[PDB]
Amino acid sequence: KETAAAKFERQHMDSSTSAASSSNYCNQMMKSRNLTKDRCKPVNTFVHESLADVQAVCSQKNVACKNGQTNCYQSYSTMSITDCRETGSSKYPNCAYKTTQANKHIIVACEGNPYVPVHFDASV
Ligand SMILES: [Rh+3]
Ligand SMILES: [Rh+3]
Protein backbone atom coordinates (compact mmCIF):
# COMPACT_ATOMS: atom_id res chain seq x y z
CA LYS A 1 0.00 0.00 0.00
CA GLU A 2 1.10 3.63 0.69
CA THR A 3 3.62 3.37 3.63
CA ALA A 4 3.11 5.34 6.89
CA ALA A 5 6.23 7.42 6.00
CA ALA A 6 4.82 8.13 2.48
CA LYS A 7 1.40 9.15 3.92
CA PHE A 8 3.15 11.59 6.26
CA GLU A 9 5.00 13.18 3.28
CA ARG A 10 1.71 13.31 1.24
CA GLN A 11 -0.34 14.95 4.06
CA HIS A 12 2.33 17.12 5.77
CA MET A 13 5.45 18.00 3.66
CA ASP A 14 5.55 21.01 1.34
CA SER A 15 9.26 22.00 0.93
CA SER A 16 8.46 23.82 -2.42
CA THR A 17 8.08 27.26 -0.72
CA SER A 18 9.28 28.90 2.60
CA ALA A 19 5.59 29.75 3.46
CA ALA A 20 2.03 29.99 1.99
CA SER A 21 2.02 33.11 -0.31
CA SER A 22 -1.84 33.40 -0.57
CA SER A 23 -5.23 32.71 1.16
CA ASN A 24 -5.99 30.06 -1.56
CA TYR A 25 -2.96 27.92 -0.42
CA CYS A 26 -5.04 25.36 1.64
CA ASN A 27 -7.84 25.03 -1.00
CA GLN A 28 -5.15 24.26 -3.64
CA MET A 29 -2.85 22.00 -1.50
CA MET A 30 -5.65 20.00 0.29
CA LYS A 31 -6.97 19.09 -3.21
CA SER A 32 -3.47 18.27 -4.61
CA ARG A 33 -2.75 15.83 -1.70
CA ASN A 34 -6.08 13.90 -2.24
CA LEU A 35 -7.46 15.28 1.10
CA THR A 36 -10.73 16.51 -0.69
CA LYS A 37 -11.34 13.37 -2.86
CA ASP A 38 -14.27 11.63 -0.97
CA ARG A 39 -14.82 14.20 1.86
CA CYS A 40 -13.19 17.47 3.04
CA LYS A 41 -10.38 16.50 5.50
CA PRO A 42 -11.23 19.04 8.25
CA VAL A 43 -7.75 19.86 9.74
CA ASN A 44 -4.26 19.49 8.28
CA THR A 45 -0.77 21.03 8.82
CA PHE A 46 1.84 21.49 6.05
CA VAL A 47 5.55 21.92 7.01
CA HIS A 48 7.67 24.20 4.73
CA GLU A 49 11.12 22.90 5.70
CA SER A 50 13.35 20.45 3.79
CA LEU A 51 12.57 16.68 4.22
CA ALA A 52 16.05 16.32 5.83
CA ASP A 53 15.24 19.04 8.47
CA VAL A 54 11.87 17.37 9.30
CA GLN A 55 13.39 13.79 9.38
CA ALA A 56 16.05 15.26 11.74
CA VAL A 57 13.28 15.97 14.32
CA CYS A 58 13.39 12.14 15.07
CA SER A 59 16.81 12.85 16.83
CA GLN A 60 15.59 15.94 18.85
CA LYS A 61 13.36 16.23 21.98
CA ASN A 62 11.73 12.86 22.85
CA VAL A 63 8.21 13.45 24.25
CA ALA A 64 4.98 11.47 24.85
CA CYS A 65 2.54 11.19 21.92
CA LYS A 66 -1.14 12.24 22.39
CA ASN A 67 -1.92 8.45 22.27
CA GLY A 68 0.53 7.58 25.14
CA GLN A 69 3.32 6.07 22.95
CA THR A 70 6.87 7.42 23.64
CA ASN A 71 8.12 7.59 19.97
CA CYS A 72 7.17 11.30 19.59
CA TYR A 73 9.71 14.08 19.06
CA GLN A 74 9.44 17.85 19.36
CA SER A 75 11.56 20.02 17.00
CA TYR A 76 14.13 22.03 18.97
CA SER A 77 13.65 24.93 16.48
CA THR A 78 10.44 26.57 15.22
CA MET A 79 9.50 25.58 11.67
CA SER A 80 7.55 27.38 8.91
CA ILE A 81 4.07 25.67 8.86
CA THR A 82 0.59 26.35 7.38
CA ASP A 83 -2.52 25.26 9.38
CA CYS A 84 -5.46 24.35 7.07
CA ARG A 85 -8.92 24.31 8.71
CA GLU A 86 -12.21 23.78 6.89
CA THR A 87 -14.60 26.77 7.28
CA GLY A 88 -17.91 26.37 9.19
CA SER A 89 -19.84 26.90 5.87
CA SER A 90 -17.57 24.53 3.77
CA LYS A 91 -19.67 21.86 1.97
CA TYR A 92 -18.20 18.86 0.03
CA PRO A 93 -17.49 18.85 -2.86
CA ASN A 94 -16.67 22.62 -2.66
CA CYS A 95 -14.19 22.15 0.28
CA ALA A 96 -13.22 25.58 1.72
CA TYR A 97 -10.21 26.18 4.06
CA LYS A 98 -8.77 29.06 6.10
CA THR A 99 -4.96 29.28 5.64
CA THR A 100 -2.88 30.31 8.75
CA GLN A 101 0.95 30.68 8.35
CA ALA A 102 3.00 30.33 11.57
CA ASN A 103 6.51 29.53 12.91
CA LYS A 104 5.99 26.84 15.61
CA HIS A 105 7.72 23.71 16.99
CA ILE A 106 6.36 20.47 15.44
CA ILE A 107 5.71 17.17 17.26
CA VAL A 108 5.92 14.01 15.11
CA ALA A 109 5.83 10.26 15.83
CA CYS A 110 8.85 8.44 14.31
CA GLU A 111 9.09 4.79 13.27
CA GLY A 112 10.89 2.43 10.91
CA ASN A 113 14.21 2.16 9.05
CA PRO A 114 15.06 4.74 8.10
CA TYR A 115 13.61 6.25 11.35
CA VAL A 116 11.31 9.00 10.00
CA PRO A 117 8.04 10.80 10.82
CA VAL A 118 4.84 8.71 10.41
CA HIS A 119 2.30 10.96 12.23
CA PHE A 120 1.88 14.73 12.85
CA ASP A 121 0.91 14.97 16.60
CA ALA A 122 0.73 18.79 17.08
CA SER A 123 2.49 22.18 16.65
CA VAL A 124 3.40 24.28 19.76
RH1 LIG B 1 -1.51 9.32 12.09
RH1 LIG C 1 -2.49 7.84 10.38
Q: Ligand 1 centroid to 13 CA: how many Å?
A: 14
DSSP string, 21-46: -STTHHHHHHHHTTTTSSS---EEEE
| Cα–Cα dist 72/20, whole Å | 26
Q: Which amino acid does the sequence have at 40?
A: C
Q: Ligand 1 centroid to 21 CA: how many Å?
A: 27
Does residue 49 contact residue 76 with C-beta atoms inside 8 Å?
A: no
| Cα–Cα dist 124/105, whole Å | 5
| Cα–Cα dist 28/24, whole Å | 6
Report resolution in angstroms: 1.8
Residues known to be catalytic:
12, 119
Does residue 55 contact residue 114 with C-beta atoms inside 8 Å?
A: yes
Q: Ligand 2 centroid to 123 CA: how many Å?
A: 16
Does residue 95 contact residue 105 with C-beta atoms inside 8 Å?
A: no
Does residue 13 contact residue 47 with C-beta atoms inside 8 Å?
A: yes
| Cα–Cα dist 82/13, whole Å | 10
Is 7 flagged in the annotation as binding? yes
User: H or E stretch including 11?
Assistant: helix 4-12
> Is the CATH code 3.10.130.10 the one for domain 2-124?
yes
DSSP-derived letter for residue 98 is E
Q: Give the largest CA-CA distance in the chain.
A: 42
Q: Sketch the domain layout of the chain as residue ranges.
A: 2-124
Strands 61-63 and 72-74: antiparallel
